[PDB]
Amino acid sequence: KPTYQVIQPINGDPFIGSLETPVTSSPLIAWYLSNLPAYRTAVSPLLRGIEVGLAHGYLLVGPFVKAGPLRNTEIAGQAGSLAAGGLVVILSLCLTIYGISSFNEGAPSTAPSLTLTGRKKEPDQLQTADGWAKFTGGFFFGGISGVIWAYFLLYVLDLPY
Amino acid sequence: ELDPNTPSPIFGGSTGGLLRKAQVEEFYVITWDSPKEQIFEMPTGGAAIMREGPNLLKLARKEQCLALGTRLRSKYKIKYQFYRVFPNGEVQYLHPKDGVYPEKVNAGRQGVGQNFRSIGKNVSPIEVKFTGKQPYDL
Amino acid sequence: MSHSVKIYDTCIGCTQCVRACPTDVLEMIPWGGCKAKQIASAPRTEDCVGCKRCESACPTDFLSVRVYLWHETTRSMGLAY
Amino acid sequence: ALRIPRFSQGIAQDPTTRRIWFGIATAHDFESHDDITEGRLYQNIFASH
Amino acid sequence: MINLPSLFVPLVGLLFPAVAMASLFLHVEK
Amino acid sequence: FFIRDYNPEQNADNVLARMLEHKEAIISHLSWASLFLGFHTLGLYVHND
Amino acid sequence: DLEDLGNTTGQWDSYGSDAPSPYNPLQSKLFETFAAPFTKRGLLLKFLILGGGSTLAYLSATASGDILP
Ligand code: CLA
Ligand code: CLA
Ligand code: CLA
Ligand code: CLA
Ligand code: CLA
Ligand SMILES: CCCCCCCCCCCCO[C@H]1O[C@H](CO)[C@@H](O[C@H]2O[C@H](CO)[C@@H](O)[C@H](O)[C@H]2O)[C@H](O)[C@H]1O
Ligand code: SF4
Ligand code: SF4
């Protein structure tokens, strides 16, 4: 009922701010994002890696196969993996040497669940390095790979119009 | 944050005030006396009404509490406190310590002033080029 | 040095003279008289930033003061954050 | 809050970028950064050039 | 084989940079 | 040399010193050359234009 | 005071959190190793960097026939 929730700016204290509002926090947005890392960690990553790798994968095709350097290609290759498959490699390790910001190094192991987590204090890290690996390892097999059922597909395609 | 509201001091929301590395370093909340409820300027673009107390709002960095302070003594009162919080409680305890109101004596603390020699003729250059025999480290 | 900009003078009296500056200065130490006899260049300075609001008012009668620590904190920066 | 590229300590700390930018552009100013002794310096310009 | 001396611009102007922009992110950490 | 090195008691009365000492003139009889060499080249070149 | 949609209605109530979705598509360990080389790593990643980047660059240029600039 309350003019917008029991009317609060933030979670409650005003003072951090973020002026929590729609597009910050509406039952409708907020939800379109929790198997995914925004709030909770669904599973120990390893898997999120490829839905991340892959979805972002078959992107970067018409960007560099329809806007390519000398464009609209007559080659077997593009439509194409090509260079883009090269980008997921540069990308994916530009990605790794960031997982040298956190190492923090363990196996604990839980994608299995005890007791509704809370994480407890997930906010902030508590991702060890042996986590950020299995993500940016999922990234490679998500990038390269997610680059082929892009071109594998014939483009049945829609014409400008 | 509902389950405990301690609050004394009254904004509503802002974009302003502290973002994440207040948790990961050093915290900095200021507290005060009040009479009858008045409407105030802030740090961070503005403003609120006070009432009473603790009257203990928390700020980002130390420049900001003192900054009211000027703020807080035009329109007056004696009593303003500012403490520094960690994560993990204490050391570095900021306004509490002896007296307040700098411009009093009990004691020295501090400061010197001169280093080794006084203001007069350092036309004289720096001297021996750093060796760990001679008193150049304070 | 890690904050070393000399504002010292000779009167170090602080009435209709100088106060301005975010925390850094507790002074009022006395030294065994100077007329008003509150003296020194400083209190302990590992707390705040680098103004020269430090003179702007009440004499230093040689150098102004200024930026110079070099050796620079974050809290002494303003930004980390 | 790590301890990091050395000769300086003053530099070696601030998180803020000044730590890199500056990192490069002391390298050459041997006299009177951390290491230096009149015997270091000299030679530290000799096997330099 | 015929006409093929194109490697000393990526190994250098491309890959050598990869090394150091990676590697030398030792300035951050190692 | 004048700031890191240089030794006012070690140098004194002594011709390199003397250069500091009688310095206010040095920049003036320099600045007098410029200002002259200034407007006089600039009279001749606008006038000419 | 009849009307009010007497506690109307609530939810339980207006909580949400406590079970809004079953979590994830089955795939359990349809990958698990499956491809190891980032699933193995300690230690790697140079190794790979010279490899990927050696092909990309190596065949990336040389030959067959020009097609020139
Ligand atoms: C690319 C981005 C850029 C960035 C970095 C930001 C960043 C921010 N914006 Mg913002 N904004 C942008 C562009 C950007 N904006 C544009 C172009 C507009 C239109 C004018 C706005 C209008 C806007 C408003 C009104 C607000 C913000 C706010 C904010 C802040 C918090 C909101 C938030 O993150 O909720 C999370 C956001 C999401 C979860 C986004 C989900 C939407 C997706 C799923 C759309 C997918 C598209 C779909 C497939 C089809 C659409 C096709 C096409 C037409 C787009 C944050 C600083 C808020 C603020 O001021 O701070 C509190 C405030 O509410 N923005
Ligand atoms: C900043 C911009 C500007 C832009 C817009 C472009 C654009 C382009 N340049 Mg280019 N160029 C530029 C500056 C620019 N250039 C400059 C400054 C130089 C000299 C320094 C060059 C030197 C240069 C050369 C030599 C070449 C180009 C080429 C190209 C074309 C190929 C790009 C490509 O395939 O990459 C891949 C593209 C992507 C992967 C794009 C993906 C991401 C995009 C869509 C941005 C993300 C927005 C996204 C939609 C977010 C919306 C919300 C979302 C949630 C829905 C493209 C027309 C090539 C060409 O031949 O031209 C025809 C050629 O190789 N450029
Ligand atoms: C020192 C540098 C330098 C060099 C050598 C190059 C070189 C190149 N640039 Mg470039 N560029 C540079 C600086 C440089 N750039 C700078 C500073 C800018 C910014 C202004 C750009 C902006 C730019 C743009 C926008 C583009 C280029 C493109 C290119 C390529 C043009 C021809 C081509 O298709 O590549 C030859 C090779 C490749 C692209 C990679 C080949 C990999 C293939 C063989 C793999 C596929 C097979 C399979 C999947 C892999 C097998 C693996 C197996 C063993 C498991 C060429 C590689 C263009 C391009 O590449 O589009 C196609 C275009 O995108 N550049
Ligand atoms: C329009 C452009 C213009 C031009 C022509 C220049 C030119 C220059 N700028 Mg410059 N600059 C500009 C606009 C421009 N700037 C703007 C708009 C800004 C900010 C408003 C700056 C801010 C700036 C700064 C702060 C500096 C310069 C400097 C320079 C000079 C250094 C040249 C160099 O070779 O570095 C080459 C640069 C690099 C090698 C770094 C780029 C790294 C990229 C390629 C990494 C890519 C990341 C990738 C995704 C990760 C993959 C991982 C892989 C590496 C493993 C050069 C004179 C510098 C200078 O003065 O030095 C003498 C420096 O001080 N500029
Ligand atoms: C094109 C240039 C512009 C002009 C006209 C000047 C002129 C001058 N600069 Mg200078 N400067 C400039 C750009 C300029 N600078 C830039 C871009 C920089 C670096 C960012 C500098 C850095 C610099 C330094 C470090 C120094 C100077 C100095 C000087 C003075 C040297 C003496 C001299 O040359 O003759 C004298 C001047 C002229 C020939 C210029 C014309 C001046 C008169 C004739 C004005 C005309 C009167 C007019 C009819 C009345 C109109 C006014 C109003 C009533 C409508 C001179 C005033 C030096 C100095 O101070 O000397 C003591 C020195 O300090 N400059
Ligand atoms: C290609 C070989 C696949 C077969 C799996 C065995 C090798 C897997 C790599 C780990 C090497 C040691 O063998 C391994 O077997 C299982 C991994 O699946 C582990 O069993 C479990 O406990 C491991 C130890 O933290 C964790 O990775 C997991 O919670 C789980 O796998 C054993 O604790 C481990 O000893
Ligand atoms: S500013 Fe100078 S004169 Fe004033 S009190 Fe301080 S030291 Fe004394
Ligand atoms: S501005 Fe200067 S004098 Fe003032 S507190 Fe800061 S350092 Fe001290």
mmCIF file with all atom_site columns, N, CA and C in Angstrom, chain B residues 15-45:
data_model
loop_
_atom_site.group_PDB
_atom_site.id
_atom_site.type_symbol
_atom_site.label_atom_id
_atom_site.label_alt_id
_atom_site.label_comp_id
_atom_site.label_asym_id
_atom_site.label_entity_id
_atom_site.label_seq_id
_atom_site.pdbx_PDB_ins_code
_atom_site.Cartn_x
_atom_site.Cartn_y
_atom_site.Cartn_z
_atom_site.occupancy
_atom_site.B_iso_or_equiv
_atom_site.pdbx_formal_charge
_atom_site.auth_seq_id
_atom_site.auth_comp_id
_atom_site.auth_asym_id
_atom_site.auth_atom_id
_atom_site.pdbx_PDB_model_num
ATOM 1  N N  . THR B 1 15 ? 22.117 10.347 -2.629 1.00 0.00 ? 15 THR B N  1
ATOM 2  C CA . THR B 1 15 ? 23.357 9.842  -3.288 1.00 0.00 ? 15 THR B CA 1
ATOM 3  C C  . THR B 1 15 ? 24.837 10.160 -2.846 1.00 0.00 ? 15 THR B C  1
ATOM 4  N N  . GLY B 1 16 ? 25.196 11.409 -2.465 1.00 0.00 ? 16 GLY B N  1
ATOM 5  C CA . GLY B 1 16 ? 25.946 11.671 -1.203 1.00 0.00 ? 16 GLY B CA 1
ATOM 6  C C  . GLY B 1 16 ? 26.826 10.584 -0.514 1.00 0.00 ? 16 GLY B C  1
ATOM 7  N N  . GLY B 1 17 ? 26.436 10.415 0.750  1.00 0.00 ? 17 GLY B N  1
ATOM 8  C CA . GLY B 1 17 ? 27.088 9.716  1.852  1.00 0.00 ? 17 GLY B CA 1
ATOM 9  C C  . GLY B 1 17 ? 27.563 8.279  1.540  1.00 0.00 ? 17 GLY B C  1
ATOM 10 N N  . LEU B 1 18 ? 28.260 7.663  2.496  1.00 0.00 ? 18 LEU B N  1
ATOM 11 C CA . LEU B 1 18 ? 29.283 6.698  2.319  1.00 0.00 ? 18 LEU B CA 1
ATOM 12 C C  . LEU B 1 18 ? 28.907 5.506  1.498  1.00 0.00 ? 18 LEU B C  1
ATOM 13 N N  . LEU B 1 19 ? 29.895 5.156  0.693  1.00 0.00 ? 19 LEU B N  1
ATOM 14 C CA . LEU B 1 19 ? 29.958 4.086  -0.291 1.00 0.00 ? 19 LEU B CA 1
ATOM 15 C C  . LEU B 1 19 ? 31.263 3.343  -0.037 1.00 0.00 ? 19 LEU B C  1
ATOM 16 N N  . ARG B 1 20 ? 31.381 2.143  -0.604 1.00 0.00 ? 20 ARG B N  1
ATOM 17 C CA . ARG B 1 20 ? 31.805 0.976  0.137  1.00 0.00 ? 20 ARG B CA 1
ATOM 18 C C  . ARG B 1 20 ? 33.012 1.167  1.034  1.00 0.00 ? 20 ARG B C  1
ATOM 19 N N  . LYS B 1 21 ? 34.093 1.789  0.601  1.00 0.00 ? 21 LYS B N  1
ATOM 20 C CA . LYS B 1 21 ? 35.185 1.829  1.563  1.00 0.00 ? 21 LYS B CA 1
ATOM 21 C C  . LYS B 1 21 ? 34.969 2.963  2.523  1.00 0.00 ? 21 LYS B C  1
ATOM 22 N N  . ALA B 1 22 ? 33.791 3.037  3.185  1.00 0.00 ? 22 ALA B N  1
ATOM 23 C CA . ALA B 1 22 ? 33.692 2.973  4.669  1.00 0.00 ? 22 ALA B CA 1
ATOM 24 C C  . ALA B 1 22 ? 33.601 1.664  5.388  1.00 0.00 ? 22 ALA B C  1
ATOM 25 N N  . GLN B 1 23 ? 33.080 0.601  4.786  1.00 0.00 ? 23 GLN B N  1
ATOM 26 C CA . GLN B 1 23 ? 33.192 -0.603 5.561  1.00 0.00 ? 23 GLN B CA 1
ATOM 27 C C  . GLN B 1 23 ? 34.600 -1.132 5.701  1.00 0.00 ? 23 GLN B C  1
ATOM 28 N N  . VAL B 1 24 ? 35.314 -1.229 4.589  1.00 0.00 ? 24 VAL B N  1
ATOM 29 C CA . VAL B 1 24 ? 36.671 -1.811 4.546  1.00 0.00 ? 24 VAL B CA 1
ATOM 30 C C  . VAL B 1 24 ? 37.875 -1.107 5.129  1.00 0.00 ? 24 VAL B C  1
ATOM 31 N N  . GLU B 1 25 ? 37.742 0.211  5.256  1.00 0.00 ? 25 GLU B N  1
ATOM 32 C CA . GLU B 1 25 ? 38.470 0.995  6.259  1.00 0.00 ? 25 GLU B CA 1
ATOM 33 C C  . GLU B 1 25 ? 37.591 1.786  7.210  1.00 0.00 ? 25 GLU B C  1
ATOM 34 N N  . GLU B 1 26 ? 37.946 3.039  7.448  1.00 0.00 ? 26 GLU B N  1
ATOM 35 C CA . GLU B 1 26 ? 37.875 3.585  8.794  1.00 0.00 ? 26 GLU B CA 1
ATOM 36 C C  . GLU B 1 26 ? 36.611 4.438  8.809  1.00 0.00 ? 26 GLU B C  1
ATOM 37 N N  . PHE B 1 27 ? 35.795 4.242  9.843  1.00 0.00 ? 27 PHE B N  1
ATOM 38 C CA . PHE B 1 27 ? 34.372 4.639  9.777  1.00 0.00 ? 27 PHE B CA 1
ATOM 39 C C  . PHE B 1 27 ? 33.740 6.049  9.918  1.00 0.00 ? 27 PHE B C  1
ATOM 40 N N  . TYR B 1 28 ? 34.140 6.794  10.965 1.00 0.00 ? 28 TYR B N  1
ATOM 41 C CA . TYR B 1 28 ? 33.918 8.254  11.164 1.00 0.00 ? 28 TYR B CA 1
ATOM 42 C C  . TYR B 1 28 ? 32.608 8.996  11.494 1.00 0.00 ? 28 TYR B C  1
ATOM 43 N N  . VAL B 1 29 ? 31.772 8.454  12.407 1.00 0.00 ? 29 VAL B N  1
ATOM 44 C CA . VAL B 1 29 ? 30.500 9.084  12.919 1.00 0.00 ? 29 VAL B CA 1
ATOM 45 C C  . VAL B 1 29 ? 30.608 10.241 13.968 1.00 0.00 ? 29 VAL B C  1
ATOM 46 N N  . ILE B 1 30 ? 29.805 11.316 13.822 1.00 0.00 ? 30 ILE B N  1
ATOM 47 C CA . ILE B 1 30 ? 29.770 12.514 14.699 1.00 0.00 ? 30 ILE B CA 1
ATOM 48 C C  . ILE B 1 30 ? 28.382 12.584 15.418 1.00 0.00 ? 30 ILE B C  1
ATOM 49 N N  . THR B 1 31 ? 28.341 13.034 16.683 1.00 0.00 ? 31 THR B N  1
ATOM 50 C CA . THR B 1 31 ? 27.154 13.005 17.587 1.00 0.00 ? 31 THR B CA 1
ATOM 51 C C  . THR B 1 31 ? 27.020 14.374 18.322 1.00 0.00 ? 31 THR B C  1
ATOM 52 N N  . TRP B 1 32 ? 25.820 14.749 18.808 1.00 0.00 ? 32 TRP B N  1
ATOM 53 C CA . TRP B 1 32 ? 25.595 16.082 19.414 1.00 0.00 ? 32 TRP B CA 1
ATOM 54 C C  . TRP B 1 32 ? 24.420 16.354 20.391 1.00 0.00 ? 32 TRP B C  1
ATOM 55 N N  . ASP B 1 33 ? 24.468 17.458 21.163 1.00 0.00 ? 33 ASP B N  1
ATOM 56 C CA . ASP B 1 33 ? 23.326 18.051 21.961 1.00 0.00 ? 33 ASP B CA 1
ATOM 57 C C  . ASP B 1 33 ? 22.335 18.761 21.024 1.00 0.00 ? 33 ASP B C  1
ATOM 58 N N  . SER B 1 34 ? 21.053 18.818 21.406 1.00 0.00 ? 34 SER B N  1
ATOM 59 C CA . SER B 1 34 ? 20.063 19.766 20.806 1.00 0.00 ? 34 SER B CA 1
ATOM 60 C C  . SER B 1 34 ? 18.918 20.277 21.702 1.00 0.00 ? 34 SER B C  1
ATOM 61 N N  . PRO B 1 35 ? 18.488 21.521 21.455 1.00 0.00 ? 35 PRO B N  1
ATOM 62 C CA . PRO B 1 35 ? 17.268 22.056 22.043 1.00 0.00 ? 35 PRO B CA 1
ATOM 63 C C  . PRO B 1 35 ? 16.024 21.725 21.231 1.00 0.00 ? 35 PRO B C  1
ATOM 64 N N  . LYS B 1 36 ? 15.443 22.685 20.544 1.00 0.00 ? 36 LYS B N  1
ATOM 65 C CA . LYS B 1 36 ? 14.126 22.420 20.012 1.00 0.00 ? 36 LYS B CA 1
ATOM 66 C C  . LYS B 1 36 ? 14.082 22.508 18.477 1.00 0.00 ? 36 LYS B C  1
ATOM 67 N N  . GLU B 1 37 ? 13.405 21.518 17.852 1.00 0.00 ? 37 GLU B N  1
ATOM 68 C CA . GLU B 1 37 ? 13.858 20.862 16.603 1.00 0.00 ? 37 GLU B CA 1
ATOM 69 C C  . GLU B 1 37 ? 14.075 21.784 15.415 1.00 0.00 ? 37 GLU B C  1
ATOM 70 N N  . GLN B 1 38 ? 15.289 21.731 14.854 1.00 0.00 ? 38 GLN B N  1
ATOM 71 C CA . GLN B 1 38 ? 15.682 22.604 13.757 1.00 0.00 ? 38 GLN B CA 1
ATOM 72 C C  . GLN B 1 38 ? 16.228 21.953 12.519 1.00 0.00 ? 38 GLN B C  1
ATOM 73 N N  . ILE B 1 39 ? 16.182 22.703 11.441 1.00 0.00 ? 39 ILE B N  1
ATOM 74 C CA . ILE B 1 39 ? 16.252 22.195 10.102 1.00 0.00 ? 39 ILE B CA 1
ATOM 75 C C  . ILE B 1 39 ? 17.624 22.560 9.524  1.00 0.00 ? 39 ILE B C  1
ATOM 76 N N  . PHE B 1 40 ? 18.406 21.563 9.076  1.00 0.00 ? 40 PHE B N  1
ATOM 77 C CA . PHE B 1 40 ? 19.815 21.796 8.875  1.00 0.00 ? 40 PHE B CA 1
ATOM 78 C C  . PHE B 1 40 ? 20.423 21.537 7.506  1.00 0.00 ? 40 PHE B C  1
ATOM 79 N N  . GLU B 1 41 ? 21.538 22.193 7.277  1.00 0.00 ? 41 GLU B N  1
ATOM 80 C CA . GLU B 1 41 ? 22.254 22.273 6.030  1.00 0.00 ? 41 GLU B CA 1
ATOM 81 C C  . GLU B 1 41 ? 22.888 21.004 5.458  1.00 0.00 ? 41 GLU B C  1
ATOM 82 N N  . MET B 1 42 ? 23.511 20.208 6.314  1.00 0.00 ? 42 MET B N  1
ATOM 83 C CA . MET B 1 42 ? 24.312 19.019 5.895  1.00 0.00 ? 42 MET B CA 1
ATOM 84 C C  . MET B 1 42 ? 25.796 19.329 5.485  1.00 0.00 ? 42 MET B C  1
ATOM 85 N N  . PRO B 1 43 ? 26.608 18.227 5.397  1.00 0.00 ? 43 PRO B N  1
ATOM 86 C CA . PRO B 1 43 ? 27.450 17.799 4.245  1.00 0.00 ? 43 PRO B CA 1
ATOM 87 C C  . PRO B 1 43 ? 26.728 17.056 3.152  1.00 0.00 ? 43 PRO B C  1
ATOM 88 N N  . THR B 1 44 ? 27.116 17.110 1.885  1.00 0.00 ? 44 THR B N  1
ATOM 89 C CA . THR B 1 44 ? 26.417 16.289 0.856  1.00 0.00 ? 44 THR B CA 1
ATOM 90 C C  . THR B 1 44 ? 25.127 16.805 0.160  1.00 0.00 ? 44 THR B C  1
ATOM 91 N N  . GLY B 1 45 ? 24.795 18.081 0.278  1.00 0.00 ? 45 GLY B N  1
ATOM 92 C CA . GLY B 1 45 ? 23.661 18.573 -0.498 1.00 0.00 ? 45 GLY B CA 1
ATOM 93 C C  . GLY B 1 45 ? 22.440 18.026 0.228  1.00 0.00 ? 45 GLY B C  1
#
